[PDB]
Design a protein around this nucleic acid. Structure first.
Lengths: 83, 136, 198, 80
RNA sequence: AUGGAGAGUUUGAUCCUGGCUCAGGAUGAACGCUGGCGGCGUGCCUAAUACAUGCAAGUCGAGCGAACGUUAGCGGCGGACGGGUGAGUAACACGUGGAUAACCUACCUAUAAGACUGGGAUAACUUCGGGAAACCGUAGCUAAUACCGGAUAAUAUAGUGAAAGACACUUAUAGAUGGAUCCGCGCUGCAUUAGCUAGUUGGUAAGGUAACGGCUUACCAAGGCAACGAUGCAUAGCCGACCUGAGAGGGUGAUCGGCCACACUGGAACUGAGACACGGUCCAGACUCCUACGGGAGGCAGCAGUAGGGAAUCUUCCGCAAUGGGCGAAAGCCUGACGGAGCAACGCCGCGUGAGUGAUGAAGGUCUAUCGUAAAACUCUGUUAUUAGGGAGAACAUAUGUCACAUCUUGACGUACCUAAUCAGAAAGCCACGGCUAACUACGUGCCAGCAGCCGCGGUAAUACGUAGGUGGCAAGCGUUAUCCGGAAUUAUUGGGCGUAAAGCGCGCGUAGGCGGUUUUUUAAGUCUGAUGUGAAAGCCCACGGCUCAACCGUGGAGGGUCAUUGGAAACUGGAAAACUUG
């Protein structure tokens, strides 16, 4: 069981977020070990999508699939369908 | 000043006791034992008025207050000012600590404080023994 | 701005220090309750509180709101004493306060009521800004200037460096934060921002 | 990730290998800084051998295979 | 290492001191005052109180027994639930590395053994029934990818279950989940508690937990201890947080908890894809209680609200729409998880309630020129206020055609930025009122009331007081409330006296050990310091970028702090051979 998470310290003024691999039975906020970065889904702050998910995209054959309406961010990419 | 016996045997700090030990406290009845609180705010409900005469350092005359706090013990006060509240049986906002020149009393009154307003002969103070709505 | 009435303040502060004043239609010597008596002598704390008599009337450099950039750039460059006197007048309310468009001391802060709104930035009808390298108080959004602010386009020329009025906006903001010279004369440094740290 | 060479000396023993080895180390306190040396006791065991009257040895941190004892190692210095 | 200037303290006096009151604030900091409005945020911190109730993870199937997948509850779920915390333990409960010669497993993802053969029972329709109800009795049931023979299923080196819509079943097996079987340092005080517990020392059991084994038991000897804290033993979370130091970090860890003690009570036959279970399941208790008194079993450590205790201690305004858990081949839910907020001027800010001002300007309020560049009566800003259209973000979806994925599918607050012409829609009132803590003079006052942050004042000029026009700080702010910080150098880890403040041995005696000759030393551990491991951090010794700047988010070059390798310098506390001698 794995889901996406995010960090929280202090700003917004544009819908922001982050990329991580937290637990399934939990809220949007979660603990992150290998910090990959964050994400800006406000269509205005383009200089904030510096997410280097290197251990988050390795769940393809481990245990992962687009869920919770988050396939839009993975729609631009295509590092899946390897089986 | 030698450090061997210093972890064998330690030292102390100074020796001091804090201010108003029978204050900052709210006495139980359910579990019968006091609370160590240091509360900002508190009440005062009256048992007598009280006054002792022999005053050397001032050598004028002015009385004080004998107001009991919770549930059977002697608690004593004083009214520092030129205002005489010829009153009792009140419910107030405590002032914590003693003003200069009265031993053993550590409990007082804020201006206004839900019981009365204050000695209304004051209008220049605007911040002493009862003074509200004062033109600045 | 004012917070009271002022012009008795010849013997309270020095003067507002960046104008002509309303000092001497009378006996301007005795500061208060001394009319038949001697002068006021010297101290450091009497000196210190004289300093801040000529800080809180000089500008709207109110306490608990101004020392802050002094301690903020106490991690930035130089013993912050004169940094402060150039950290309380390196604003667009100061790069435009010597610009000479005011006739009340409040009208360099009120240069933008409906005067100078958008200095390369968003319309801001305020006293102050964050006057970084080349930071003005420049032309209005749907207007340009008013008849209480543009009525003094160059009401006094030679307004300081980094206040180089390219007019019909009535402000100049040449380069950066200002070298504290072109500001109060008899003021000091270790008696501006070395009195405050205690 | 291997298992250390913990060592020490011996004090006493009881019936059929109630064995032990002493434990000690060089270190100090965080407060008043003196090089005072310090120790605590351990629990190894043998058939009956590693025991009192001279057993300067080594010990281990492994699976004890023991009651509350913990060690399997004896790597010696000498005997008496 | 962005390095430590506090008010006054001695007798009568320079002088070595002596710490106090005390400072400023910072506190989930507010109480009378004062109550232009707000960006955003938190408030049973009074009582982890007794209860106006319910409240809460929930519904369903081209795979299945009612009707024109409705109407089941089999099956799946749930049940250990979100949330509530810091009532209860000195404990591996807690932050990090970690032997696994102490561990494994379906939920995230692909699957894979195949999909063969089976019987037939149970919920509902209840089928039949006593009786305040509803509690209970007869009792075939009708099915189910199921209650369910049997083949080999894998660890004999010889273990069984699968009953797929359509052009979805059960297994050999897995990556994984909370964890952890556990290792380690994490892991506080009480010397008014040492002659040490009988298991103290540890080997030896039929046993068994995914887990070695004094863990109950298996066999025998204790001096195992030993004056070193055996043991008792009192609060009993830790850890990103906050005021903060120069730095060591040093403390409180409450908004903010990522981990754990905890749901009336003692349990509890149970159980689970995860157990003794906050609206479960039973039987002992004392509670406001409901009941033809079948006897009901419930308590908001989960939103409210009631009698409250109350320094303040809040909206039962709304209901899924910001995430789908679960049910479902599907269209769909419940949100009470998360949301929508009277807003307390509690945080402080975004700034707005007067202007071009004005000749000194009056009818003068401490003083008798002072705050008077007081005033008027003229003008200037939208920004408070008459309206208005108000659509800030953003992408949702089998059949549309053939897990990258999508249209004929996303406006309660959805109206914000509200320039907007804009009148003049005041920013309460400040303390002591001298000098320090920063303050200005006096009539009242004749010791009658009485001033007073350490210092400190009225007896006939309170440069203090009653009161009166304000200069030092101020305008959403006046006096007070009390907590540790550098300051307090009144901890002394950096920064501790000996004859004398407030301080030295009755000493012949003297265990443990702190210390403990000269030189070479055998050591090759360690320090010298370091190749390496260079395993992530949001942010670090830094800075910056989104943002009407402030409430709310982010690149991480500082390697994550001997962490995955032990070092070469014997100059030495360190496996430790001696010699020197006059000490």
């Amino acid at each position: 069981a794995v889901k996406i998470r995010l960090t929280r310290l202090g700003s917004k003024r544009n819908p922001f977020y982050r990329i991580v691999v937290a637990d399934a039975r939990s809220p949007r906020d979660g603990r992150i070990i290998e910090q990959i970065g964050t994400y800006n889904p406000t269509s205005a702050n383009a200089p904030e999508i510096k997410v280097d998910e290197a251990l988050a995209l390795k769940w393809l054959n481990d245990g992962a699939k687009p869920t919770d309406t988050v396939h839009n961010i993975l729609s631009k990419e295509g590092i899946m369908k390897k089986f | 000043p030698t450090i061997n016996q210093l972890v064998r045997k330690p030292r102390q700090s100074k020796i001091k006791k804090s201010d108003s030990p029978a204050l900052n406290k709210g006495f139980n009845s359910k579990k019968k034992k006091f609370t160590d609180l240091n509360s900002p705010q508190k009440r005062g409900v009256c048992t007598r008025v009280g006054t002792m005469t022999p005053k050397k350092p001032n050598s004028a005359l002015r009385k004080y207050a004998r107001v009991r706090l919770s549930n059977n013990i002697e608690i004593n006060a004083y009214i520092p000012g030129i205002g005489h509240n010829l009153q009792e049986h009140s419910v107030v906002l405590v002032r914590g600590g003693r003003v200069k020149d009265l031993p053993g009393v550590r409990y007082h009154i804020v201006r206004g404080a839900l019981d009365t307003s204050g000695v209304d002969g004051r209008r220049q103070g605007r911040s002493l023994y009862g003074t509200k709505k004062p033109k600045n | 701005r004012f917070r009271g009435s002022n012009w008795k303040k010849s013997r309270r502060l020095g003067i507002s220090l960046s104008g002509t004043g309303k000092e001497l239609e009378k006996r301007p010597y005795a500061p208060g309750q001394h009319g038949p008596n001697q002068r006021k002598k010297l101290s450091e704390y009497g000196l210190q509180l004289r300093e801040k008599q000529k800080l809180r009337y000089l500008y709207g450099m109110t306490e608990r709101q101004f020392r802050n950039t002094f301690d903020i750039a106490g991690k930035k460059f130089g013993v912050h004493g004169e940094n402060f006197m150039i950290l309380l007048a390196s604003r667009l309310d100061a790069v435009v306060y010597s610009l000479g468009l005011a006739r009340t001391r409040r009208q360099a802060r009120q240069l933008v009521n409906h005067g100078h709104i958008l200095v390369d930035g968003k319309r801001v009808d305020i006293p102050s800004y964050s006057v970084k390298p080349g930071q003005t108080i420049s032309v209005r959004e749907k207007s340009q200037k008013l008849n209480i602010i543009v009525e003094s386009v160059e009401i006094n020329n030679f307004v300081p460096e980094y206040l180089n009025f390219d007019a019909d906006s009535l402000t100049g903001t040449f380069v950066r934060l200002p070298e504290r010279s072109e500001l109060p004369a008899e003021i000091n440094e270790q008696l501006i921002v070395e009195y405050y740290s205690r | 990730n291997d298992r250390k060479v913990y060592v020490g000396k011996v004090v006493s023993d009881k019936m059929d290998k109630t064995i032990t080895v002493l434990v000690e180390t060089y270190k100090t306190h965080k407060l008043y800084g003196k090089r005072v040396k310090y120790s605590k006791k351990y629990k190894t065991h043998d058939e009956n051998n590693s025991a009192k009257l001279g057993d300067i040895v080594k010990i281990q941190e492994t699976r004890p295979l023991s009651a509350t004892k913990r060690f399997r190692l004896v790597e010696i210095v000498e005997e008496s």
